[PDB]
Structures are given as C-alpha cells and as structure tokens.
Design a protein around this ligand. Structure first.
Ligand code: COI
Ligand code: CYT
Ligand code: CA
Length: 540
C-alpha cells in the first residue's frame, strides 16, 4: 500500500491553511476508498525546517510513493532534493516555485507570473503603488514582478515576518509615500495589516492575491471592506464545498479545494499502476482534469493552469468584482482605438508626403517602406491610382499585387466618391485573406486627386490584440460587423457567420448590455471614418 508524505506548515503563521489542507486530504481519502496512506509532517516556518521534514520523511518511509509540500519556500527547497532521490513531488499552495530539474515536481498552483499579469489590469490605474510582502520567496517574487511591471508607480517595497507581525516601521515608510494602492502579499494576517494601516492614517485602496481569501480577513471587514484581489474562479457548486462545510463547520478556501483535487487525481494515478516518478509526472503533464478547482490543464513542464478573476471583500462576504467585466471591455476598446488612431495618423502623414512624389517609383516606394515599419499590425502597404489599380507596394515581396484592379472594393468606391479617408469592412483582399484596409486619399501639389495610400491589417489583427487582453480571465470577447457578420471569435468556426442567416440589438446600437442562455453580454464599438465594429464581452 503506497505511502504519500504531506509536508504542511503547521508551526507557522499559516497554521490555518495547513489545517485546512489536512482536513481536505483526510476527507478526500476517506471517500476515494484510500488508494494510498497519508502521513503528515510539519514543515514549520522556514526553509530549513521543511528540508528537515523531507529528509526525515525519506529516512522513515521505505514505500514512499510521493511527497507533497505546501508553500513556495518548502516546495522550491524540496524540488531538487526529491529529484536527486527520485521521489515523485507535488507542490500545492506554491505560486513562487523555482524549477531547475525538468520533468520533476508537478504543481497545482498557478504561478506568480500569470496571476501578476491579471492583477496588473487593475493596478495600472494607480500612479502610486506600495507593496508590503511576507518575507519569503513568495513575497520577494511578487515584489520583483511588480517592480518590473510598474517601475514608475511602485513607490515602496516593504517586507515582514508573518510570525512576528512587527509592521509599524514598514507602515510608517509606506504612509510617508502617500500611496494610492497598497498591495499586500499576505494570507490571513492581512486582517491585522489592514487594521494597523487604517489606524496609522493610510487610506489607500487595499489589494491582495490568492492567499488573502481567509475568514479572518472577512471578519475584519471594518478595515478590509473594499479590498480587491485576484483569485481562482472555481464555483461553489462542487460537492466538496458542502461536504467539507458540513463536516468541519466552515467553508474550505483555495488550499482545501486544491488539496482535494490533488488527492482525487493522485488516488486515480496510484490505482492505475503508475508508481515511478516518470509515470506519475506523465499522469499529470499535458492533461486536463475537472474537479473542485474547475477545469485544470497541465503544461508539459508540469504546471497547472486555470482561470482567475477579481474578487473583493464586502460586509456580507467575498464577492466577484463586478467592475472587471466592463473594465476588460473598455481596456480592450481603448487599445484598439489607439492602434487605429496610430494607423490613421501614419497613413495621413504618408498621403501628405506622396503629394510631391506621386504613387509610383523609388521615392513613393520609400514612403511605403517606412509606413509599413510604422505599422506593426500591417500586412502590407500600397498605393492605388485614380482608376483603382494598385501601382506600388511594400514589402516588395508582395509585388504580384501590383496591377490588381480593386476599383470594385466597397471602401475604394467610397474613397473615390468622397475623396475622404475610409476604413473598410472585413472583405477578401487580393492578398488572399479576409482583412481590413485603411486608406487616405492623395492630392498633388495643385490639389488634384491622384489616388490613395493604404495599410492593410494582418489576418489575425483582432485576435492578436484581444487574446492578450482576455488571457486567463473566464470571459470571451468577439467582434461583429455592422451587418451582423462575425469578424473575430476565439472559435474560428464562427468567423464569417452572420446573425441574420441580443444579436438584433447589437446591429443598431453602438453600446449595450444583455443576457442570454446563463451568460451576461456587454458591448461597445470601435472604428474610424464611419466604419464601426461591435466589440462584445461575454461571461457567465
Ligand atoms: C502558505 C501559503 C501562504 C503559501 C502560498 O500560498 C504560496 O507560497 O504560494
Ligand atoms: N493591399 C490591399 C489594399 C486594398 N485592397 C486589397 O485587396 N489589398
Ligand atoms: Ca500526460
């Protein structure tokens, strides 16, 4: 009967997390039929005490199938040791895991980097940012990340021992920098940090991360109310939530939920005969599991991934932050408008220049070559004469489009009939894909119309912008044409589909919201020169 060793920080500031994890593990094992035996060890408060628990655990257990460790510091220290002794290793409650041995250590905790990328969407609207972080590799990793992302805005980076909780100094340093947001890299001890900071006159918006969602923090809503934090987006509907609550008298937080999915999946692995470190690692690596944490996907390097959301502390409980959905849509609308504005300016400037050079030849080509470098979302740039014929292009590798008659393209007609700039609908281009063309008219020295200059955007223009914005949030953003045609959707099978073949309202209104089936929908519009696209965000 295989033995799994489980090292948790019982003798430490994170006692409560440790007991939660222990509870969840024991609950999980009782029901699964006990595919393995558990022995618990006390990792203590620092790295040495955890390395000692591991070494002791190895000395005392011959049939040791695996070692599970809680905390970024325990896990980073055990990782190379387990590898050397060829013991399968799982890290839980470990966002700042440092990997050196490829193919070793499976990790169920989403990393600092991913969580930091999401938190940055909120923090970017604060010009003065203070950080107070636990003095261990989780704190220091968050500090180093936040400092890299926000060089100018980060005005203070203070550490604290979570066992000692002597923070009067750090909080003095901090108040003296008049921060706009105070980021706490803290678990439950944040309720005390919050109290003292408010009593010390600090009025800054409090901000935290995954570990901060503890009952202590909610109880202290007198001080913590309004605090915004990033958190895994699993729902409460899983049977584990209720089983744990009924047995132990309180709801399990992240660490319980995580520890329950570890037992469930490891149990199944040890039943199926997987027993070597390589087999146990491969069990997880590349795989998707659905469980109490929701849908969990493991990369080839053994790291779990699952979506996060913004949450906030309120008087009545921990809540999903309503603000994030319109925020993400607006932030995306804004990046798109600024990209379009940049393109429009560059093309307008290029038209001014082509006035003296004409549209053909080496001087024209040079304007085109530069215009393309000025437009990172360009596929190419052309000039088009008064007849609607492409007469020049950069990059020159697309020289075959020269001579192509595009006088029948809808935007080209409009430019010819208005002698004003146009942004096309998403139409099939001679280059071989459905794209979007921005054109400005060109006039010679005497004011006579001589044609137009164009930037054609990349085939994946919208996707390349949108997918970065929505990365790891449980939402989708799509783009619709005025006539209802889908221009961009993360599911490409939908691209090109109409909605005349809430959709009706999206056609006629530039902004809106709605609900279908249960999903919420928000939309706005982006565009130029009378060509507007609808930008919609959906979420549960
Ligand atoms: C005991 C926890 C605060 C540790 C944790 O959540 C982490 O290291 O990522
Ligand atoms: N580069 C292009 C501009 C306008 N229309 C096209 O089909 N291609
Ligand atoms: Ca696998």
């Amino acid at each position: 009967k295989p033995v799994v060793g489980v090292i948790l920080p019982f003798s430490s500031a994170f006692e409560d997390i440790a007991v939660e994890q222990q509870r969840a593990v024991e609950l999980a094992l009782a029901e699964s039929g006990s595919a393995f035996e558990i022995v618990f060890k006390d990792g203590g408060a620092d790295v040495d005490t955890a390395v000692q628990a591991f070494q002791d655990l190895v000395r005392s257990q011959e049939n040791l199938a695996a070692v599970v460790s809680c905390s970024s510091w325990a896990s980073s220290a055990i990782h190379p040791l387990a590898a050397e002794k060829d013991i399968f290793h799982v890290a839980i409650g470990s966002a700042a895991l440092k990997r050196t041995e490829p193919g070793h250590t499976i990790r169920l905790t989403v990393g600092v980097q991913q969580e930091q990328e999401q938190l940055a969407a909120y923090l970017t609207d604060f010009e003065r940012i203070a950080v107070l972080a636990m003095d261990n590799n989780l704190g220091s990793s968050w500090i180093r990340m936040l400092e890299d992302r926000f060089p100018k805005q980060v005005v203070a980076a203070q550490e604290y021992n979570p066992q000692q909780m002597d923070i009067a100094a750090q909080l003095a340093t901090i108040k003296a920098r008049d921060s706009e947001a105070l980021v706490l890299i803290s678990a439950g001890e944040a309720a005390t940090i919050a109290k003292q900071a408010r009593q010390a006159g600090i009025k800054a918006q409090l901000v935290g991360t995954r570990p901060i969602q503890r009952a202590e923090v909610l109880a202290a809503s007198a001080f913590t109310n309004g605090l915004v934090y990033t958190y895994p987006s699993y729902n409460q509907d899983h049977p584990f939530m209720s089983a744990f609550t009924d047995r132990y008298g309180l709801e399990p937080g992240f660490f319980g939920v995580e520890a329950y999915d570890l037992c469930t999946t490891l149990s199944r692995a040890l039943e199926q005969g997987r027993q070597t470190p390589k087999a146990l690692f491969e069990w997880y690596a590349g795989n998707t599991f659905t469980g109490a944490l929701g849908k969990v996907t493991f990369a080839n390097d053994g790291d779990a991934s699952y979506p996060y959301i913004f949450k906030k502390v309120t008087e009545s409980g921990f809540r999903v932050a309503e603000f994030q959905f319109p925020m993400l849509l607006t932030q995306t609308a804004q990046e798109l408008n600024a990209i379009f504005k940049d393109m429009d300016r560059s093309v307008a400037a290029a038209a001014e220049q082509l006035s003296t050079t004409g549209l053909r030849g080496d001087r024209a080509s040079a304007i085109l070559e530069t215009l393309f470098n000025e437009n990172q979302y360009a596929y190419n740039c052309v000039t088009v004469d008064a007849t609607g014929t492409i007469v020049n292009v950069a990059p020159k590798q697309y020289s075959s489009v020269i001579g192509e008659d595009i006088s029948g393209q809808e935007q080209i007609i409009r430019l010819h009939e208005t002698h004003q700039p146009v942004l096309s609908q998403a139409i099939k281009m001679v280059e071989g894909f459905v794209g979007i063309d921005l054109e400005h008219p060109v006039f010679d020295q005497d004011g006579g119309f001589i044609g137009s200059v164009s930037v054609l955007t990349q085939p994946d223009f919208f996707g390349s912008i949108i997918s970065r914005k929505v990365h790891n949030f449980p939402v989708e953003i799509f783009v619709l044409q005025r006539d209802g045609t889908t221009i961009y959707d993360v599911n490409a099978e939908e691209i090109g589909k109409n909605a005349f073949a809430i959709a009706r309202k999206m056609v006629s209104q530039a902004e809106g919201e709605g609900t279908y089936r249960a999903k919420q929908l928000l939309w706005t519009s982006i565009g130029l020169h009378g060509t507007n696209y609808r930008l919609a965000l959906t979420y549960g």
